[PDB]
Structure 1
């Protein structure tokens, strides 16, 4: 009898949930098995059927734990290499992070069955997508958020990619949970009608993939070069060898590439301390008709005679004469949680011994900043983690933007799937805004993404290489570039409002 007790059957559901959760990791790069997203969501919606809320919440937690425990544990690579803590602590911190994010899938499951206990199409097709949209927003907002592993991104090369330029990637998250909900409903109820509807709703967006919301601008085509210095991890001697690598790789490209790009924090020294190098390089670039965009750390003295330390992008050369007082620059807005700041650190700071506090704290640039301009080219900039924040990138985008720009350094996570998941989401921005995206990294993944998310050029990871190719700007506004998120939030409110009112009836 034991195998069939009520608690054992609940536990079986918890194990299955863990498995279905882990299957969802296969949807994202480098695995790119986009059907695994539909499989993972079908289990989440099937295993929560006919459960009390706290049971369902536990199922949603274990589902998320399988998803995040298997799709985010690459953060271990950075913790174990630079954290200085024993192995067990490092494992525990990774488990901790996955348990934290699993709270939001648990919240989704608990709320879904509490308000929509019955196995309906309303539950799986109306309430679930609406509620999923809410709990996923909270995951990406609370404590500055971590909106990593959103199944919509797995459709970058899939049947539903045509929806992203219209309503953004969250619209794909929305439809996937609806389509997966109906498939789950068809199987447990062994009924063909929800299957047909799921197939229609899933296939209707297919032709949209062929819409080109943009027009190429051939007369503005240029040769761009992206230097992948592949620099490992307080030594001037090594900074000089870093400028040597970048200068020597860049010098033969001046006069040939109109735009040259070094990655995040390529110049591993304060801008204040490199005026002679930067002015000399400015002159050489200007005298050959080339421009350089580069990452750097800028400790800027402020009104209060203190230093705001920014993660910065500077410009030099033709159409961007370098100057410490230039406004042709970009300061990272969204810092990496636990990388560039610790959440809640401002509140709990007065109690910390001064000697234990970090030497410097990173400051944040404004949420909206103008495009960078180099050699007459408009570049909407995002640094590293910022490229995953679709709404933010779209609010900095302007109709005159020629290319999206992202520079980053993903060496912290070595050979793991992290950099690939990051690269995957970056491509969704190019598709959302119908602009080519230039992605310059330290040791990968360095690539040019076309206006429909396609990989147009790329150099392999872990190589000291220059990616040189011709790139063409685009003009035109996708429906999502014009609107942003609010169309889907209306649809989410319509769905949410209609579902909860019927649950009250």
Structure 2
């Protein structure tokens, strides 16, 4: 049998005990997670962060476990996504005290994405006396935890631990089970290293712990660089245009026309290529009222035997009066199709509780928007006879959602505007998650940005071609259409999710099961 409590005199009990020291370690532990992500990319920190949290929950009761999970999550988001403050301050025009209070509220609320599972772990799931089962149960809890984060309210799938393995040794597992399997193995390892000393007395158990600990790592390295997809056709020559049109939230007539003339003038001279791509809302005019600018741009592409792909605000006139808006992208030239954004950022593209909050937002002079969600099932964009999966801005962040469109495609395309966050680590984290989509999908991704990290991503998630951010530039490069299905795109989460459900159900039942001192 095993208690698990560290022997007295080791200076390690405060970690797993109720009180402020254990919470402060958890706060710092959570703050490691951005370190393991881009741009720092110290991926072993991801294991340490989770290992520290797992250890800090060992003896803990439910009420203090909940708050210790809140402190961990507060450190993760307070350090990992605090960069959201830049958009609110610099482009929302809010003062620093105001913007600080908003971000303080946000990360304190978002920190409950780690508080709730911690509380669930303590009250119902944790088995301190079974080291091997506890590690599996914790890993399977980590999956549920991130899966829940993708779904709840609108979802905030930021800082998944799995993204640290994009260029890490576990990159071989990402095409197999997605970012989900990557997070699962990082948590599983982290709990095994904690409980590994407890298996030293026992040979067979320790051996089994070592296979579970290092087996998947070996499997990830063995599968690193393996191509599950095959060439579908001749390479496409791609030109992406990055015009640092200063974001003006008050959108004014004289700067609009200079946008239309900037993107045109930059496209014409480019010697013939297969694809011209423009970033998010590259043409600022509504789709219906830009027939002239759009129509001319198609013939310019036609003379260049090319397809032009650009983001454009799209309007829908209802039967009664006023319109409805969408953040769309459309294709002209050698191609067709128009895609409408489905995932909308709350408080950026729309107001989630507009009736109460509208007046409140207005008194503090905060920007508001009224974009609407795209339909459930939309066709893919067509360009030179190929199926191009479209992603606008942070739709790339939702892995299950991305996989549905990534399948049934031969190339991946995203246009996004990272201007809002400036020189912070947001755009790099955002970009990193875009590369994971290429690695899960075994497809090339074209990423054109209004100003931040435009590039071409090979099917291994590696950035083969890119241009400097924060300056006007053009990216010339070649991407290859891809055929075939990765295992992750074939089966998605369900194989791993079912395994996790079993492990959670086992732990839940096994925690309360009589250990062969049966009453019957």
Moved >6 Å (runs of 4+): 3-9, 188-192, 349-359
- Structure 2 runs not aligned, ≥5 long: 1-10, 514-520
SS at match of 1:232: coil
Q: Could you tell me how far 1:379 is from its partner in structure 2? A: 0.7
Q: Could you tell me how far 1:357 is from its partner in structure 2? A: 11
Partners in 2 of 1:196 and 1:92 — Cα distance?
Answer: 48
What does residue 247 of structure 1 align with? 264
Partners in 2 of 1:351 and 1:90 — Cα distance?
Answer: 18
The answer to whether the aligner puts 1:29 opposite 2:45 as a matched pair is: no
Q: Could you tell me how far 1:352 is from its partner in structure 2? A: 8.2
The answer to whether the aligner puts 1:265 opposite 2:277 as a matched pair is: no
Which is further off, 187-196 or 279-288?
187-196
SS at match of 1:337: coil
Aligned match for 2:253, one of 236, 252, 269? 236
Contact 2:342/2:376 (CA < 8 Å) preserved in 1?
A: yes
Cα RMSD (Å) of the superposition? Answer: 2.5
Partners in 2 of 1:5 and 1:464 — Cα distance?
Answer: 54
The answer to whether the aligner puts 1:375 opposite 2:389 as a matched pair is: no
The answer to whether the aligner puts 1:215 opposite 2:241 as a matched pair is: no
- Structure 1 runs not aligned, ≥5 long: 321-327
Aligned match for 1:69, one of 71, 74, 78? 78
Contact 2:16/2:55 (CA < 8 Å) preserved in 1?
A: no
**How many residues are treated as equivalent by the alignment?**
492
The equivalences for 1:83-232 within 5 A come to 83-115=92-124, 116-122=126-132, 124-186=134-196, 193=206, 194=209, 197-217=212-232, 219-232=233-246
Q: Could you tell me how far 1:489 is from its partner in structure 2? A: 1.6
What does residue 276 of structure 1 align with? 292
Aligned match for 1:289, one of 286, 305, 312? 305
Question: Aligned pair in 2 of structure 1 residues 202, 426: CA closer, same or farther (>3 Å)?
Answer: same
What does residue 54 of structure 2 align with? 45
Question: Aligned pair in 2 of structure 1 residues 287, 467: CA closer, same or farther (>3 Å)?
Answer: same
Partners in 2 of 1:307 and 1:468 — Cα distance?
Answer: 38
The equivalences for 1:288-327 within 5 A come to 288-320=304-336
What do the CA deviations read for 1:177-230 (whole angstroms, capped 9, x no partner)?
A: 11111112225787793466423343333212232101123x421210000111
What does residue 325 of structure 1 align with? none
What does residue 489 of structure 1 align with? 497
Partners in 2 of 1:329 and 1:236 — Cα distance?
Answer: 25
What do the CA deviations read for 1:128-166 (whole angstroms, capped 9, x no partner)?
A: 122222232222222111110001011110111111111
Partners in 2 of 1:7 and 1:36 — Cα distance?
Answer: 20
Q: Could you tell me how far 1:6 is from its partner in structure 2? A: 11
Contact 1:258/1:289 (CA < 8 Å) preserved in 2?
A: yes
Question: Aligned pair in 2 of structure 1 residues 357, 338: CA closer, same or farther (>3 Å)?
Answer: closer
SS at match of 2:59: coil
Q: Could you tell me how far 1:126 is from its partner in structure 2? A: 2.2
Contact 1:459/1:465 (CA < 8 Å) preserved in 2?
A: yes
The answer to whether the aligner puts 1:82 opposite 2:99 as a matched pair is: no
Q: Could you tell me how far 1:397 is from its partner in structure 2? A: 3.0
Partners in 2 of 1:215 and 1:404 — Cα distance?
Answer: 15
What does residue 478 of structure 2 align with? 470
- Normalising by structure 2, we get a TM-score of 0.89
Partners in 2 of 1:392 and 1:9 — Cα distance?
Answer: 40
Question: Aligned pair in 2 of structure 1 residues 191, 43: CA closer, same or farther (>3 Å)?
Answer: farther
Contact 1:112/1:123 (CA < 8 Å) preserved in 2?
A: no
Aligned match for 2:415, one of 365, 386, 407? 407
What does residue 466 of structure 2 align with? 458
Which is further off, 57-66 or 68-77?
57-66
Contact 2:259/2:283 (CA < 8 Å) preserved in 1?
A: yes
SS at match of 2:324: strand
Which is further off, 259-268 or 117-126?
117-126
What do the CA deviations read for 1:310-330 (whole angstroms, capped 9, x no partner)?
A: 10101101233xxxxxxx110
